[model samples]
Target chain A: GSKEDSVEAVGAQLKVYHQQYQDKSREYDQLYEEYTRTSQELQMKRTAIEAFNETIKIFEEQGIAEIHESRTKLEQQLRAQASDNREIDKRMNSLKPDLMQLRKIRDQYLVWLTQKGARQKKINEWLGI
Target chain B: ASRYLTDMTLEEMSRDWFMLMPKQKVAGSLCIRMDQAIMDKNIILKANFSVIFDRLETLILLRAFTEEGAIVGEISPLPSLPGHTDEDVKNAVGVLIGGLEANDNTVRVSETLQRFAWRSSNENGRP
Candidate 1:
């Protein structure tokens, strides 16, 4: 009789295991379905990105005329800016001689003023007026 | 530097999409961004799987350039495994439009359809 009861108890535990196992099976199946869907989607999206990159690569590789046009315009601008800077540089360089001359004239006038001031001071001292 | 700042403005613009990342990740299973930082390579600063999942269908999946038509950022949905959200696929068109409008108001955002079509793949079992 104990043996008989042991067999039924074994059957009872088996039922619980089956229940757990079946639940797991269901969960796994549902998860795989989701995986399949996203997998396909991710694949397509990735393919799209690839194709897009390739298109750009084509433009990059083939050197599209638009970009060539832009390059030409940019070159012209760089040349213009360079010339502009050069003009400014030349003008500033040309100012150097004028600056030196102005400094020379200022010193000569300063010396003359200094002698004139000494003469006036002597006259004031000698004349006592 | 505040954790990981490389100070790239384009990456900062790309960050417009990244703003949706979660403030925290509890499981630490998925990559969590601890710092909002970038070098030549990108780092994960913060994220939410569900949020990313929701965006996958219509996410730009690539760059959305500046108002001047210069690419400023890549705008793909976050990587998710096990499943993709069934949300409708969206154009990054409006994403940048609203962002530029919402932030600066005058900036423009656009992409050529020729590029999008060339880039988009028909492999997803679409009829």
Candidate 2:
């Protein structure tokens, strides 16, 4: 009977140990899930940072090339403008005859208007008499 | 950081910006026409002039991006003679845009956009 009682006690202890083991296993599983989720998020963030770094690198390279291209374009534009100014001056000189004709016509019109004003005033005086 | 979803409408994205600069006067709308393909996209942004007040006029463009909603880009003409016409304002806008586009500095574009927005706000009241 003593031996049987001792065996029963050991069985109870074994059951308790199994329960504790199961509980610990469940906790570990939960923690592992959480860790996995956290790891995935960290990886995604790292990828984003890498992408940003690459974009920045590309932009830097492009920026240098653009500066050189802009300088060249500006120089070309300046030269074109210089040539354009000379052409414009030549064209303005060519239009001198037309400008002189327009000025003469304007003066003639002014004189005509002045003469008409005098004639109208004389007509008004004659009527008054 | 505002992670803007590119799929959102312009009105949705502009809500925050417009509210941020409420006292700024909108000179004109900015228009950016974009052509999208399977792998690439082409964008053509045009700046148009609309407002003129005593030799001070504003040129603007409205651009909508797939990732960034509606953004307004504006340019203010250098104060010239009061009799300056719309053509002169257009020319100034052209020059400003040309200068900006010639350089590949995205920061310059962003800075200019901010500067113009601030200038417009200070000059005219309301965004």
Candidate 3:
């Protein structure tokens, strides 16, 4: 009777371990999806900061030189530069909204890692290690 | 009549009283209504016009020759509704200076006025 009881206990334990594995796998899939999406968004903002510097440099050199060629050209150049600055300001502002959520998402992944460590320790108890 | 600022001449400007800036790809005319006055101290030459772009316009008063010297002159923009920024005024001055310099190469602008080519409007100053 005791031997049969031990076999049933092993089957029950195996079912719990498999279920835990599925749960951890699901959690990992979700966190990984979030991480990849957030990383792509952050990369856009990083690229934009670098690109905008080049934009200003071009405006300062080539753009300024044209207007200096004639007094009549000033009005047209001002309008064009103003329009460009407006769009640049808009794009720069777009990065702020996503930045606000960065730390929260990072902390979520951090907590998930801690939870995974505890999960591994629980499995080790079953192994009597 | 080619409508390019690059092709504009003092003779054409004096005759037609208008110059077109085709860089905008629009039919925008820069009207410089020219006039002259001989005062006791100096002879004054004026080129007054409204610089219109994107619904906002500023009245630019360009004195190409003034009491200071033939080459010493000033270009100022009168403040208007939907007003221009300091940058707008500065660039307008530069544009006017550029136009005058390119068209009237016989006369050289004084170093003081040439530096002022990049000047912007200040509230206390006369336009």
All candidates: CA RMSD in angstroms? Answer: 39.2, 40.7, 34.9
* Candidate 2 lDDT by residue in tens digits, A1-129: 685464344434434443444455565455556545645555554565556455668788655344545445545554555455455455555544444333333222222222223232332232231
Q: What are the clashing pairs of model 1?
A: A48-B119, A52-B119, B33-B44, B33-B45, B57-B89, B58-B89, B58-B90, B67-B108
* Candidate order by decreasing TM-score: 3, 2, 1
Sort by lDDT, best first: what order?
Answer: 3, 2, 1
Give stretches of model 2 more than 4 Å off: A64-129, B1-127
**Span of 10 residues, lowest total lDDT, candidate 2 chain B:** B118-127
- lDDT tens digits, residue span A27-102, model 1: 5455556545644555555555556555667777555344545445545554555555455455545544444333
**Residue B105 of model 3, lDDT score:** 26
Model 2, position B65: C-alpha lDDT score: 30
Name the best candidate (by DockQ).
2
Quote the chain B TM-score of every prediction. 0.28, 0.27, 0.30
Query: Where does model 1 exceed 4 Å of error?
Result: A61-129, B1-127
Lowest lDDT 10-residue stretch of candidate 3 chain A: A106-115
RMSD (CA, Å), candidate 1 to true, equals 39.2
Candidate 3 lDDT, tens digit per residue, A1-129? 685465445434534544554455565455556555545555554555445455567677654344333433434454555555455455545544333233222222222222223233333334233
Q: On DockQ, who's better, 2 or 3?
A: 2
For candidate 3, the chain B TM-score comes to 0.30
